[PDB]
Design a binder for this molecule. Structure first.
Ligand SMILES: Cc1cc(/C=C/C#N)cc(C)c1Oc1nc(NC2CCN(Cc3ccc(S(N)(=O)=O)cc3)CC2)nc2ccsc12
Ligand SMILES: [Mg+2]
Lengths: 412, 556
């Protein structure tokens, strides 16, 4: 690949100028070693002071690997980079991916370092290895090849990728293969034995076309909108019925036909919260009629690819996290729950960071893009710590929730 | 002739779509013109500038200035216009090291690199834009026109290009001499090490032999400075550092200007003098742009000042960093949203100190502030030392566990241990998870007329206790909090409270221990006095017993 594909920023926009955040000494040392080798291999070059641009970098460790890895936060550059209609008018996001029994995630970002980047665009990929205590100027580099995590890389490489896969695709017509950024998602409907074989067959096939040896395995079979469930009790207190009417009142914003009049009737008076209230027949029927309403899907829910996806997360305690993905309020496209996050029984922020990555991965499989997160955390706590637990080569956008939502109760 | 390596040229461009400057030269007196001709003749002999023909259309004005007893003329080329039109650069000098991050270097030498500066060539394609004109005597001949071959002092790119050029030249020497440190400040190059004096002088000679590869001669700085280095507002001694003298002025009249400098001195001092406080003195500058408004001091600002003078009476010093020892950060609560901390490796030998002031907000609590202080110190410590310190915090381990397991937000603080230094951070109240058996149930509500601002707040209970209070100059949100306050006031030690106010629930569920609202504050005071409180929410206007009854009582 000697020819470079011309690339430009969007009209009237300069390159990114994002401050490098401070790094620990061990991460700086890891980045110096990594970048020295990338420089020896021609992937990056030192730049001079006439380049004013900057993109943050940091260092991580992928899922159960001990080698440090460089991660560039290209969020700013990606939004300043021209929209890409790469080889065609677009890749129709494969709606069958989310239906496969198993989906394996393969890191193919290594392929990008064999394709040269347009010489006039390289300056915009500038990044800095920072010094400790400002004691030296940072080490300044720019990319000479397609960088991992940049929006342009999958698009500019897509012609090559389709050819690398065609022989495999030819023999395996029933396997769905989808690329998002640095990752390949490989879905099929056969047992892991033949699935892992196919996966290992795919990576060997890739190794002969010019890797990583690692993979992730998903089961999009299960992803849906979880139903609203109501309690089934033989004795209801005043408090129980108040919680029930509150939850139903919330559900009536989502579902038509929900009624609470006969349930509220039971609370006639000014009763102790712990007093047991017998259900009347009218209230039982109304509750049953609400249960029936809640068995059906919500009315008028559809994905619009022109709108952002929004993901909300609630901390439920004891390592459990609930989340909802939507574009308009009360029109959930997907909801779910996470428990016993691995390796962080005593660290809320690690658990939240892992939930964010899992939810982003589900969003990529279902829609081909990442949601904007509403995170139940103070900004300063999140921004001090999330990079410590990040293991993905993409990074979504997020905002912070500072007022506790009442809805946490309803997804409880 | 000993061949010398050229200094690599930095390519430079004007901002997109902008041309070079075209500013008219001012008329000058005959005396100034004579002085400029002699200065520029000498600069031209040294290669700094070259004479140019009349085809170059750019121009920047030149001036001649003097000094009080320094009795010779000075040349000034005003590149403000060219600077507006020149591309942005990587400004590689913005932040400075904090002294507490430096490590001991027994031996330091200061080299003058002011002469090396003029070996940095200006990009040849950019020189045309630096043209200037010495007007002629009596304006009877064409003015003498020059352009720069070197980095003009005052031009936008000179500091970043000079710095980047020296760094690149110095890089192999630093890399192959890991036992020395090199730091450039303007025309000064500071070369330090912890070697014996003889070996140190050898490294210096080796550095000069290195710099000679580019023809750079670097003598020792004029009038070598005895310790301590006066630098960036610090005193750098061989084994200790501190700030330069903190002298608080004595005054009977303080203006907005006086208090600003007082806080600045206090803020600067807080990095080594532990326990400095600036809340009360800062509250006197809330909103005002007139800097001579004499603002009288409150008795609280007077007390704060006096407390700072007691802290400032004697000099204190910080030590330098030892990477072989642990790094420890201790925090104390000072009151009114103020926090102080010390970072050290050995007890009683601070690397540095600092402070943290509560964020602006309507409600807050001490645990959240302590958490914010920890994140701030964490980030500062990564900046200065490249690692997170071990924390010593005035909060019991059990208090922290209760907080983070129950709090609705994710929260984290890194490795820490409790230190029993009052006042301790505590949880002042905790709401019940379930309704309390045997506790009276208060159904509360309030409402207000949006036009008249007239309102009512009240409650009804399962025992038939009731209260409605008429209120003036109020709002719905205010009446809803007032209703909760009345139920707390009028109940026993355990109480169930039912509200339909999502607003009030949102405030209380945030677990504030202090508020900018006196009403919230009074509710907090009541909660602190209870043994058990269960707070339940119901939707308004749904016919829920108890809630419906009080709603009608407070809605007119
Ligand atoms: C080397 C240096 C000098 C200065 C001074 C400017 C002025 N004006 C500033 C910085 C940032 C420097 O840069 C680094 N300084 C250190 N450490 C220091 C070295 C100096 N001492 C003070 C001292 C020692 C000996 C004598 S003495 N006995 O020779 O008179 C006098 C004063 C404290 C520690 N470490 C690094 C690491 C990377 S850069 C850098
Ligand atoms: Mg009401």
């Amino acid at each position: 690949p000697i020819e470079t594909v011309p690339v430009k920023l969007k009209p009237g926009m300069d390159g990114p100028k994002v401050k490098q955040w401070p790094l620990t000494e061990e991460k700086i040392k890891a980045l110096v070693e990594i970048c020295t080798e990338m420089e020896k291999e021609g992937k990056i070059s030192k730049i001079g002071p006439e380049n004013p641009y900057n993109t943050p970098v940091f260092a991580i460790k992928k899922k159960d690997s001990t080698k440090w890895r460089k991660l560039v936060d290209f969020r700013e550059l990606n939004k300043r980079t021209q929209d890409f209609w790469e080889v065609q008018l677009g890749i129709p996001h494969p709606a069958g991916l989310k239906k496969k029994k198993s989906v394996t995630v393969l890191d193919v970002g290594d392929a990008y370092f064999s394709v040269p980047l347009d010489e006039d665009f390289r300056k915009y990929t500038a990044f800095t290895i920072p010094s400790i205590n400002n004691e030296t100027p940072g080490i300044r580099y720019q990319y000479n090849v397609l960088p991992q995590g940049w929006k342009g890389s999958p698009a500019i490489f897509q012609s090559s990728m389709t050819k690398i896969l065609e022989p495999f695709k030819k023999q395996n017509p029933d396997i769905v293969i989808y690329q998002y950024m640095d990752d390949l998602y490989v879905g099929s409907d056969l047992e892991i034995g033949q699935h892992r074989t196919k996966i290992e067959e795919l990576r060997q096939h890739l190794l002969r076309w010019g890797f990583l040896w690692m993979g992730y395995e998903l089961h999009p079979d299960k992803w849906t909108v979880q139903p609203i469930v109501l309690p089934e009790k033989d004795s209801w207190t005043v408090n129980d019925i108040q919680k029930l009417v509150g939850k139903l009142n919330w559900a009536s914003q989502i579902y038509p036909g929900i009624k609470v009049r006969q349930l509220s009737k039971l609370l006639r008076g000014t009763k102790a919260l712990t007093e047991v209230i017998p259900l009347t027949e009218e209230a039982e029927l109304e509750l049953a009629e609400n249960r029936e309403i809640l068995k059906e899907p919500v009315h008028g829910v559809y994905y619009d690819p022109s709108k952002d996806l929004i993901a909300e997360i609630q901390k439920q305690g004891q390592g459990q996290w609930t989340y909802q993905i939507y574009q308009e309020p009360f029109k959930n496209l997907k909801t779910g729950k996470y428990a016993r996050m691995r390796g962080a029984h005593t660290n809320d922020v690690k658990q939240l960071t892992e939930a964010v990555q899992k939810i982003t991965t589900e969003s990529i499989v279902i829609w081909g893009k990442t949601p904007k997160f509403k995170l139940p955390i103070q900004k300063e706590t999140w921004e001090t710590w999330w990079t410590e637990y990040w293991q993905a080569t993409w990074i979504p956008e997020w905002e912070f929730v500072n007022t506790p939502p009442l809805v946490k109760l309803w997804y409880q | 002739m000993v061949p010398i390596s050229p200094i690599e040229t930095v390519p430079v461009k004007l901002k997109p779509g902008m041309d070079g400057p075209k500013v008219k030269q001012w008329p000058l007196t005959e005396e100034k013109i004579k002085a400029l001709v002699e200065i520029c003749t000498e600069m031209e002999k040294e290669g700094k500038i070259s004479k140019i023909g009349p085809e170059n259309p750019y121009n920047t004005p030149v001036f001649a200035i003097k000094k009080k007893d320094s009795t010779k003329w000075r040349k000034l080329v005003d590149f403000r216009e060219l600077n507006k039109r020149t591309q942005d650069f990587w400004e590689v000098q913005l932040g400075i090291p904090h002294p507490a991050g430096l490590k001991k270097n027994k031996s330091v030498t200061v080299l003058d690199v002011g002469d090396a500066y003029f070996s940095v060539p200006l990009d040849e394609d950019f020189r045309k834009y630096t043209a200037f004109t010495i007007p002629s005597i009596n304006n009877e001949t064409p003015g003498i026109r020059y352009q720069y071959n070197v980095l003009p002092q005052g031009w936008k790119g000179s500091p970043a290009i000079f710095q980047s050029s020296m760094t690149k030249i110095l890089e192999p020497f630093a890399a192959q001499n890991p036992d020395i440190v090199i730091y450039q400040y303007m025309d000064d190059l500071y070369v330090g090490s912890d070697l014996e004096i003889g070996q140190h002088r050898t490294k210096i000679e080796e550095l000069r032999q290195h710099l000679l590869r580019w023809g750079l001669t670097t003598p020792d700085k004029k009038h070598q400075k005895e310790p301590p280095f006066l630098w960036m507002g610090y005193e750098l001694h061989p084994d200790k550092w501190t700030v330069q003298p903190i002298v608080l002025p004595e005054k009977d009249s303080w203006t907005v200007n006086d208090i600003q400098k007082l806080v600045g001195k206090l803020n600067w001092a807080s990095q080594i003098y532990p326990g400095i406080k600036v809340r009360q003195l800062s509250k006197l500058l809330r909103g005002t742009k007139a800097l001579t408004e004499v603002i009288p001091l409150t008795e609280e600002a007077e007390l704060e000042l006096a407390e700072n003078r007691e802290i400032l009476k004697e000099p204190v010093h910080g030590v330098y960093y030892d990477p072989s020892k642990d790094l420890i950060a201790e925090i104390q609560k000072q009151g009114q949203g103020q926090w102080t901390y010390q970072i050290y490796q050995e007890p009683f030998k601070n690397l540095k100190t600092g402070k943290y002031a509560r964020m602006r907000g309507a409600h807050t609590n001490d645990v959240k502030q302590l958490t914010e202080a920890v994140q701030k110190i964490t980030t500062e410590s990564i900046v200065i030392w490249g690692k997170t310190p071990k924390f010593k915090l005035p909060i019991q381990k059990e208090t922290w566990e209760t907080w983070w397991t129950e709090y609705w937000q994710a929260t984290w603080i890194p490795e820490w241990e409790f230190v029993n230094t009052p006042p301790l951070v505590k949880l002042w109240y905790q709401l019940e998870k379930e309704p309390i058996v045997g506790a009276e149930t208060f159904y509360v509500d309030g409402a207000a007329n949006r036009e008249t601002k007239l309102g009512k707040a009240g409650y009804v209970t399962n025992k038939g206790r009731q209260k409605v209070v008429p209120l003036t100059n109020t709002t719905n949100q205010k009446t809803e909090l007032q209703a909760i306050y009345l139920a707390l006031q009028d109940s026993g030690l355990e109480v169930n409270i039912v509200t339909d106010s999502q607003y009030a629930l949102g405030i209380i569920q945030a677990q504030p221990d202090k508020s900018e609202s006196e009403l919230v504050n009074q509710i907090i005071e009541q909660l602190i006095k209870k043994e058990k409180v269960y707070l339940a929410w119901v939707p308004a206007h749904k016919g829920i017993g108890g809630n419906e009854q009080v709603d009608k009582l407070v809605s007119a």
